[model samples]
Target: SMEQVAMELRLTELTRLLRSVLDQLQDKDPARIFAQPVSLKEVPDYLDHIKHPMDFATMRKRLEAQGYKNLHEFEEDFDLIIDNCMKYNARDTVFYRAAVRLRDQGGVVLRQARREVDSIG
Candidate 1:
């Protein structure tokens, strides 16, 4: 009873709302890099260039663990995922442009979820 009650306390509708939005961002990653952390073996300089790394897989882990305290908190981590991608890859690169598309598409996904469920605090 307490766990169920606490699960309700765990998050507002934001749990479902964030999860779906997170899915869209991951789905939009045509380059497939956003699905998980960037492997150093794949790009030896990746972490050195990007300091605060973030990804949908890590975000999903945090979300499921109730790491976020509110919708804004969730949104920041969401933004961080997109932010890192753009910062690391040059604008002309396919990886960079893919994130550009992911960024815009994700903004809509998040807004749609927020407006559809306004009480997500």
Candidate 2:
């Protein structure tokens, strides 16, 4: 149950990020619109680059509704990844394609999450 919930929550988070990026693309939002989207798959793929020392442990713990013991470490690694993602999504048009892919992948996750949640009721 916790695993399912975490997955759903993650999907929601991805959707929220994508929407924010898209909104910037569509209009001049003060939220400082992404200059461009170069990688349609930026988020997921960018995240894949980092090898997590504690993923298995962290994920298991997460499934048990436990907090990450090395959250700061993971956050540090992700900070680098996230920075590049913004560069790809905001700076380069080629990377914009990747961002679109990432958004699509996230969409699949979000849809699955919605179904999972729906079935829980």
Candidate 3:
């Protein structure tokens, strides 16, 4: 319960910071909106690079609920992973693509990818 409360506070702060940054960007560059999204499949493959110590299924469940529009958006949630006390041993981009694949495709693909990651550990 304490962890959850602290996480909520951190998330609130992150949201406020993101909003302020976006507001400033909009003011400076009116046309530079977040429109073009790079697909998970379009990015370079990194299935072999991902690694995690344990509790992958639980992590997958947690990640699936998040709404990440792009890789950067997904990476921003790194604090979520770290704060949850999960041992994530991959680059932010690796998790980003994996989560995007999970969100776009399904659990099957995500599980397959996670298997590769598990074997790496």
Candidate 4:
């Protein structure tokens, strides 16, 4: 059930990501603007069809054309792109990651400190 739920979530998230990617790519120049929103339905021809596993080669080529060095470089700047994506879409992952980050970052250590008037003296 968890897998199913996660799968559905990832699928939904992936769809959103794909749309964001296209809309982003389209904005390179004013003349190249997307007529409407983009989606996976418009997967570019450069991508190989029926790959064994998901291949980003086509995406890589597109990014290369746009002057990206590699996927890692692009991903490293995801926070910037995510700002644009947020204008078009919103997701629960932000809250989820925030909670997870807090869980990891939050640490507590407590020690009692007390003294009577005589002890202080």
Best by lDDT: 1
Task: List, residue by residue over 1-121, the lDDT tens digit for candidate 4.
Answer: 9998876665554444434553444343233222222335664531253222111333434443553332334343333333333333335555334323322332110011112111322
Estimate every model's Cα lDDT from 0 to 1.
0.78, 0.40, 0.36, 0.35
| Candidate 4 Cα outliers beyond 4 Å, as residue runs | 33-121
Give me the candidate number with maximum TM-score: 1
TM-score rank order: 1, 3, 2, 4
Each prediction's total of clashing residue pairs, residues at least 3 apart in sequence or on different chains, is 0, 19, 0, 0
lDDT by residue for model 2 over 14-119, one digit each (tens)?
Answer: 4444344333322322222223332336456643543432212233334244332233432343233334554434555644444454444434544554454446
Which lDDT tens digits does candidate 3 get at residues 1-121? 9998876665554444434333332233223212122223753442333332222233233344433333255334433333222222234654444434333333343344335434532
Provide TM-scores for the models.
Answer: 0.80, 0.28, 0.29, 0.25
Residue-level error in angstroms, candidate 1, position 27: 2.0
What's every prediction's RMSD, in angstroms? 2.8, 13.2, 16.7, 20.5
TM-score of 2: 0.28
Model 2 segments more than 4 A misplaced: 1-94
